[PDB]
From a paper:
Therefore, we set out to test n-Decyl-beta-D-maltopyranoside (DM) (1), geraniol (2) and its synthesized dimer (3), as the mimetics of myristic acid and farnesyl, respectively. ITC of geraniol with HBc showed a slightly enhanced micromolar affinity (K_D_=94 +/− 8 µM) ([Fig fig2], [Table tbls1], [Table tbls2] and [Fig figs7]) and a stoichiometry of N=1.01 +/− 0.04, implying that all four hydrophobic pockets of the asymmetric unit are occupied simultaneously. To confirm geraniol’s binding to the capsids and to resolve the molecular details of this interaction we conducted cryo-EM of a mixture of HBc with excess of geraniol followed by single particle analysis. This experiment resolved an additional density for geraniol in all four hydrophobic pockets within the asymmetric unit of HBc capsids ([Fig fig2], [Fig figs8]), confirming the thermodynamic binding data and further defining the underlying molecular interactions of the involved HBV residues P5, L60, K96 and F97. However, TX100 binding to the hydrophobic pocket affected the spike tips, by flipping Phe97 in the pocket, but the geraniols resolved within the hydrophobic pocket did not flip Phe97, thus suggesting that this cross-talk is ligand-specific. Binding of an (**4**) or of (**7**) splays the helices at the tips apart similar as previously reported for binding of a P2-monomer. Encouraged by structural confirmation of geraniol binding to the central hydrophobic pocket, we designed and synthesized a dimeric version of geraniol potentially capable of simultaneous binding to the HBc dimer. The analysis suggested that the dimer engages with both HBc binding sites simultaneously, resulting, however, only in a moderately enhanced micromolar affinity of 63 +/− 8 µM ([Fig fig2]).
Numbering used by the authors:
A (entry chain A), B (entry chain B), C (entry chain C), D (entry chain D), E (entry chain B), F (entry chain A): 1 to 143
The structure:
């Protein structure tokens, strides 16, 4: 069974394939903003929204991955494989969770409509040849 | 932030901490169940329910963990570390995800009321000593 | 084309694989059942029901496969090849036709509601740990 | 439990033995026509018609036989045996399956009364000695 | 994505796969026909019909292919390759575009109903063996 | 007969002559976004819009050109002419199809009104002398 974690929200993975991978901020940055903006709603006993319902799960899965990484650092004495596994986690799974958390936070903050429009516009930008594409990449803004 | 994945749905981890590991089916079995019963919805573009949302996220996180274990079995060359990490995944996070998938599937099937009452009754039963409890546990079923 | 032989009836091959292959009765037993209970209806000049139509066609396809088995055992002299081909036919196509004929006979005799709920229930039952399920396997009964 | 695949619709193997075996088209051509004209109806979750049900089952049985032929070509080492059985599966079976698909596709396109009138008339034509039958045989058409 | 250029219009390639190459006029002839009959529309600034849209696109693609063949005949200096590519174009894509232009022109002229019924009847005729079919094919015409 | 593939849509070739040739993204980029955004509508059996009706044809013609290029790579042994023809295709016909696919995708995504306004504004930009033209080239955006 294959599931798209955005189809439920009106998007797809080919639509987020527009954005490059080095575009998404650090998981730390994303979690800090998620806290600052939605702590009382994520720690709440309510189906505040599907985006909260899903952000909670993403945060908990990243927490389990962090627990795995620290478990490795404690147990595995072989530095080669210890570091290999920890780096694999933080790089690859970090990228996937960056995409996910970015989608959810940005949508909660701005609007899924605005976020899909941002995706198409950023696709325009990154497809445009450099000689003609502005340096002011599209930026999501409430102001 | 500290999140409880069930508070949003009306439960806690202290209400599921009593359920022993012997209670929970394989993760493969629970995934087969979820597929057979709710594939047309999980693979659908709808906020069918917070349960469907959370189940999608859980399935995807488990897929990520399995890909991690596979990557380990391929790359790592110290069987000590290989065994350690693969076992830790399939046991610890296997059990967490078994709890999760079971809670969601069972609520979807029976009802929040039914499942929470069953958790209460099973907790009474398992907090009771053998010599003072019936020998056959409580049971959730549709025949 | 990709046709699902049960989609037209409300089921799927995934749903019928929710049950093990060691649950379905032999083709001879199922054909005896079909004769006994619906001979004059399957031999009738009427669309008595879509289940009757499908059952007629499945009976005819299995008859052709058995005709092939006899033809092979007779003409094909190579014992190894006749063994392998007859074994493949029997085993594999028998699992398939066992699932099919079981579904059709059972639906005719009981109800699509009953038979689908039975598939679900028996799958959950056989995936559940023994100590937390009813002790007697589910049975599909008329009385 | 002898069953006539056409009695359920209003014909019988006697009425179709009128047409020779050299008459019926290639099974590939017939499946192409089926695709072209009824892909959406056969891949639909509806009892659109008994003809639809029967055609689905016929296509599926032919697919089973195709898988048998492939599995033979790969497993059976004896070239003689594999070629003999594959040539059988094609000639001897495809004959019946061509007859069947033809009946179904025709009675779906043109209708039962028309197909039966056509069978009677083609029987007249093909029974007439060659010295007295016109060159313009009966054709099954809409114009 | 896999597209069928006729599904949008109510047909398939399996419904036109029966039409043999001997059936289709020259591409030059079909283009002369399209011009003479619908130039005032194809050269017009209107969504006259999906057929006109598709016909415009087909004509332009064929013009591009002809410019390609011309560029080859000019630049390339190995007559082997020159012949190979020019012939491949004018035969393979010539035939595809003949199918296309014919379908569009004929639908525009006669009707979706008429053309699809003609395809059905011609497929019956061409799937029939010579000894069992009339000797003169079906015909689409306005006298 | 000369046809403008945009006059039907409210544009011209002198209007797109504004945009340079090195402005349009790769055909791969365009096809990827076309898939992600319009797969279910292009593979649909409906005149969803003239832009779909035309995008399907453009994609199919580019597919035929890719088939020609691979056919060349297989057949033509002479590397000089093989590479010459393949490069001609991918460069020149690629440019033409880039212009076309860009027009259609951008219009479906944003609005033909917005796209023509973008064309005139980009003409302003690229006509403006460098010393006074901003680096932030005009960019199409939903956000
Ligand atoms: C919520 C997800 C996807 C993972 C965390 C699982 C967990 C910590 C369960 C505790 O009972
Ligand atoms: C890990 C979870 C909760 C979901 C899937 C993450 C992923 C691979 C996204 C791809 O864009
Ligand atoms: C649709 C266009 C312009 C080209 C493709 C032609 C084709 C593949 C026809 C199959 O019958
Ligand atoms: C190849 C097709 C379908 C149309 C014409 C492409 C072209 C030369 C556009 C110029 O802007
Ligand atoms: C697979 C099915 C339904 C039938 C096999 C062919 C037959 C027995 C008769 C056709 O004239
Ligand atoms: C549909 C028919 C008559 C045969 C093929 C399917 C089958 C026997 C089991 C389902 O996989």
């Amino acid at each position: 069974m294959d599931i798209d974690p955005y189809k439920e929200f009106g998007a797809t993975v080919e639509l987020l394939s527009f954005l490059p991978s080095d575009f998404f901020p650090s998981v730390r940055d994303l979690l800090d903003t998620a806290s600052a903006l939605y702590r009382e709603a994520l720690e709440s006993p309510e189906h505040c929204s599907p985006h909260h319902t899903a952000l909670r799960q993403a945060i908990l899965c990243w927490g389990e991955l962090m627990t795995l990484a620290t478990w490795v650092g404690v147990n595995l004495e072989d530095p080669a494989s210890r570091d290999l596994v920890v780096s694999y986690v933080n790089t690859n799974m970090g990228l996937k969770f960056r995409q996910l958390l970015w989608f959810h936070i940005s949508c909660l903050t701005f609007g899924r409509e605005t976020v899909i429009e941002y995706l198409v516009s950023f696709g325009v930008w990154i497809r445009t040849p450099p000689a003609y594409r502005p340096p002011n990449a599209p930026i999501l803004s409430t102001l």
